[PDB]
Amino acid sequence: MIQTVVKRDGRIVGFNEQKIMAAIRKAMLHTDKGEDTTLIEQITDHISYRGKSQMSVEAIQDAIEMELMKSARKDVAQKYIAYRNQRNIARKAKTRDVFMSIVDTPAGMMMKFASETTKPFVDDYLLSEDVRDAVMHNYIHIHDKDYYPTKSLTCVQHPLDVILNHGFTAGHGSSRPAKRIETAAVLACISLETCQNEMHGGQAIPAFDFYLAPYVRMSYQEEVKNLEKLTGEDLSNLYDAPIDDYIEKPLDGLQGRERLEQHAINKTVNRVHQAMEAFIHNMNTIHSRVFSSINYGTDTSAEGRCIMREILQSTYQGVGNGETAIFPIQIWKKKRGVNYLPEDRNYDLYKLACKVTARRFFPNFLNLDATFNQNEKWRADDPERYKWEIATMGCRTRVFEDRWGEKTSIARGNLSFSTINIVKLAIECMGIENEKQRIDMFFAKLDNILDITAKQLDERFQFQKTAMAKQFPLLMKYLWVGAENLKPEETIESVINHGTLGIGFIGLAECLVALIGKHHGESEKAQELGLKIITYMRDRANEFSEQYHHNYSILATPAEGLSGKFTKKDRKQFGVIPGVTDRDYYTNSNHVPVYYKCTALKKAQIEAPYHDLTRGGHIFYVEINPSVIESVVDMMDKYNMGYGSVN
Amino acid sequence: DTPAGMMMKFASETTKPFVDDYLLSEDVRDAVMHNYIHIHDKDYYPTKSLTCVQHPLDVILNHGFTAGHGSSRPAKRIETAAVLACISLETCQNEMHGGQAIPAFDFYLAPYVRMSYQEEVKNLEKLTGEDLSNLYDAPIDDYIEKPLDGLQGRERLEQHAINKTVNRVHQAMEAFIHNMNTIHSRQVVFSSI
Amino acid sequence: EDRWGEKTSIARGNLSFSTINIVKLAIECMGIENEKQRIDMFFAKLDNILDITAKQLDERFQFQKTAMAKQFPLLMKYLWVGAENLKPEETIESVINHGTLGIGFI
Amino acid sequence: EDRWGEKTSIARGNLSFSTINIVKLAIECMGIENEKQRIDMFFAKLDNILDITAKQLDERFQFQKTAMAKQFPLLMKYLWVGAENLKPEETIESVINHGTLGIGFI
Ligand SMILES: Nc1ncnc2c1ncn2[C@H]1C[C@H](O)[C@@H](COP(=O)(O)OP(=O)(O)OP(=O)(O)O)O1
Ligand SMILES: Nc1ncnc2c1ncn2[C@H]1C[C@H](O)[C@@H](COP(=O)(O)OP(=O)(O)OP(=O)(O)O)O1
Ligand SMILES: Nc1ncnc2c1ncn2[C@H]1C[C@H](O)[C@@H](COP(=O)(O)OP(=O)(O)OP(=O)(O)O)O1
Ligand SMILES: Nc1ncnc2c1ncn2[C@H]1C[C@H](O)[C@@H](COP(=O)(O)OP(=O)(O)OP(=O)(O)O)O1
Ligand SMILES: [Mg+2]
Ligand SMILES: [Mg+2]
């Protein structure tokens, strides 16, 4: 018969026939009709005989189920199997993640639960038939689909002046306008964190130096007032006294009323340094607990320069014990006539920026001299000229133009963006040996996929309106264009049509190899064909914008949540192809593949003429001494490069 | 109506049936269904979380903390200790499902009022060149602020430092309250002191 | 209080708690007409419900162990009682017992 | 070692210990012709004997507590770990779990 049973943990025990009987009985006492031991005895006798003298618990339960689903009582088997499976799932939850398979920080687990429970229901009940079929067959990717039922937007550029000047009331929390540098930075961090919860993208602050400039003078005035209180003097003429720069100088060797004109500047510099050092640590820890971007560089004043040189020296020492800071993402705004040439006003700040980018990976560089960035309403004497300087985010997104409004990049943002796979569009028509027919079929299918993605974006726009203003407290009261005439229970459809709808692509080297012998980085004809298809998409986007009364733009997708979710589903359907579906990850939107070795000059020369057709966003990533960064910035200046992120 | 609220509702509704059907016993489920017992925070059952903790602030103030990729040096004033306390209270809320409390607020924040008193004195020494080495550990009965209507020598150079220390602790005690109240927009963290 | 520690309210908290419905038991014990047998039946039901509640709390405690210290970064490195002698991959069994279990009523 | 205390060896000792006869279990498993079956039977009997021994040690532990500290003046006033916090009439339950239980073999 059977002598020994091995438990699950590993213990060895003697065979006990009164254990199978009591287990079958508890499955017979949960059905419509129970039974006495008439069949239990037969099952146990059959199991005990025909054994191996040593059996496991699972090896006995398998036999129990096999016997139960074989003798006239198939209703006890289906109660036995389900209970066994539930107990197995319960025991597998002590060291694994079974609950995610059925459908580490607790907040992350809850967010994953929400995303997984939301995605399929949106995929089924909200999308139309044609768009659903297009999405199913690995054609188009709808970014942040989990947040679809929450009629949410992507990002916005914060007009920090409103908050800093009038105060903000969000819920039961109200805050007055600031009066020094130790509160303006905190209020900026509060605004970023608050608006992050209301949108599924990043947060950016344009004109970082301009907004905080007025709060460097206030600290100086407070220090002067406190300095004249213990001496009984009268320093009323120093309040509006112009200052060349807030440079710290040693105090020894002076006396009188010119010695205390420097103590105030010294302590003002110290306070501004501490404030800018707290900003970085806060925006790093909050993310490590939020996509944050700050752009600055086009201010010429003693206060803006002080802020720009304190931030650029607190980002040099790093965080903690010298560690580099991942956030916030810092961007330098370079213009011809402000801080570029050696004789311009802020050349030393530019030199410091180039030095810091060689140790701490930041800042980036945004070129204001490009054709698509220049604005005609700019004059370097208006104190509010920052409204006409373009700003970008760390997520590679641009919103400058507008067909029914001003050409500004403040208080505007993205509404939605979707990505179109074109490598499959090339493999699906790789069979043809004649080039002309192959290209014609490629274009014919590209037209249809573009129409489908435009219809999907229009439908998502139609769903995103009908959202009450109260659902977004901070965004639709202080941080959007017309968000000052909207009642709490009023639809935002009267101001929603000021954002950007993005159409992106992933992979162009692969498409050309699946089309012609090589990619754009080796063959000129492939480069011409790629430029042609990009221009065709841009013209179709213009037609869509004219037809649907919206704004459409072409984007180079950042490839942060779509790096791999396009090539596995093509390997499983088309097989391994040399140089196309044999690398793991597709190459980026229009870059140069990381394996085709090139120099910076050739890469820049080939990749430059795409930025004029990628108005929705583009990057110039170069892998690698301040001289190297200076050369990179000069190379960007020589061409129409819009955004660069050399490290 | 806020997106975070909708996501949390989805997550809780997803979690509850799994807890009912896979993790509870048969006698517990019958009592739960027949309106006998109520299990608090059942939506957080799969996340093996705790409810409450009393924060020891001296550990994170004398030394620093390294959570994730961030780091922080030990506090050296009153305008950074009151911020590190907020950071700890907001960071530990996402790892539990209850409330956060700070015991002995006065004891924990006391050793930094004195450090604030020793920097204004240093600035005064740098301005009016003296030594002032005996003012550091002078036993102060109270940090009360009074007007400077008539003083001279080493008696108004010691009241001025007290005035500045009081003005710097007021602006941090109000910042603590404002920061803990404004977590509604950014459920608001349940905090006690 | 602590049966295996010191009377310290620092670095300690609650693990979980459940509440017990008392009024339903009293409504169930309402057809009795002796004023002395009714209270005895109420107590008999209350004892069983308390036993089930304690069993549920113990089972939740057993599940709450086997949790790695690395999914509670700040709590199990600085803020808990013995957190300092723990490693990221170790479970919190050795220090979890300083918390409390709660039985409620309404 | 200590699962609920520090890893010291001062003021700690042994509560009781019991020994298990292994040779008799092997003599009983001697008529089996197959070697692997013999070893499996030996382990099956050893597991049961270990369970009974642990039960006996736990029962003796339960009896050993509820002993007044007055019965061991010096030991429960100065020599034990948690002593000096105990009244003469208080039992030693709170400080008895720092000892060790012993299973032995020959
Ligand atoms: N001692 C045994 N002798 C024979 N078969 C056994 C024995 N123990 C378990 N089995 C087999 C046959 C039973 O139908 C089946 C159910 O096991 P069960 O008695 O619930 O044990 P278990 O390992 O789950 O223990 P527990 O639930 O008490 O921790 O396992
Ligand atoms: N309520 C029930 N309904 C149906 N079948 C049951 C029920 N209770 C027990 N059984 C059956 C299937 C089980 O595998 C067997 C023994 O029950 P049980 O000991 O609870 O299961 P188990 O061994 O899978 O659990 P565990 O892993 O928790 O020890 O009897
Ligand atoms: N808002 C904040 N969020 C997170 N960390 C912060 C914040 N503000 C300050 N910190 C950090 C910066 C330091 O690492 C630490 C202590 O600050 P602080 O007292 O200025 O120390 P320190 O030694 O760097 O000062 P200093 O060099 O200016 O004399 O707290
Ligand atoms: N961390 C914070 N979070 C939110 N609001 C804050 C925070 N810190 C300060 N505040 C609020 C408090 C005030 O309402 C507002 C401006 O503070 P502050 O610069 O001290 O000016 P004030 O109006 O209090 O001036 P004064 O104290 O001179 O009268 O910001
Ligand atoms: Mg510092
Ligand atoms: Mg104030």
Author numbering:
A (entry chain D): 1 to 103, 120 to 305, 311 to 645, 652 to 674
B (entry chain C): 120 to 305, 309 to 315
C (entry chain C), D (entry chain A): 422 to 527
Authors' description from the paper:
To investigate whether substrate had any allosteric effect on the conformations of the ATP-cone, flap, and GRD, we determined separate cryo-EM structures of tetrameric and dimeric PcNrdD, from the same grid, in the presence of 0.5 mM dATP and 0.5 mM CTP, achieving a resolution of 2.6 Å from 1,105,348 particles before post-processing for the tetramer and 2.6 Å from 1,132,695 particles for the dimer. Both forms were almost identical to those seen in the presence of dATP alone, and no CTP could be seen bound to the active site. Two dATP molecules are bound to each ATP-cone and one at each of the specificity sites, giving a total of 12 visible dATPs per tetramer. Interestingly, all contacts between the two dimers of the tetramer are mediated by interactions between one of the ATP-cones in one dimer (B or D) and one of the core domains of the other dimer (C or A, respectively). While this allowed us to build complete models for the ATP-cones and analyse dATP binding, the role of tetramerisation in the inhibition mechanism is unclear.
Class III RNRs, which only function anaerobically, are dimers of an α subunit (NrdD) with a stable radical close to the active site, and binding sites for allosteric nucleotides. Here, we present structural, biochemical, and biophysical studies on the ATP-cone-containing NrdD from the human pathogen Prevotella copri, showing that the binding of dATP causes increased flexibility of the C-terminal glycyl radical-bearing domain, as well as a flap-like loop that binds across the top of the active site in the active form.
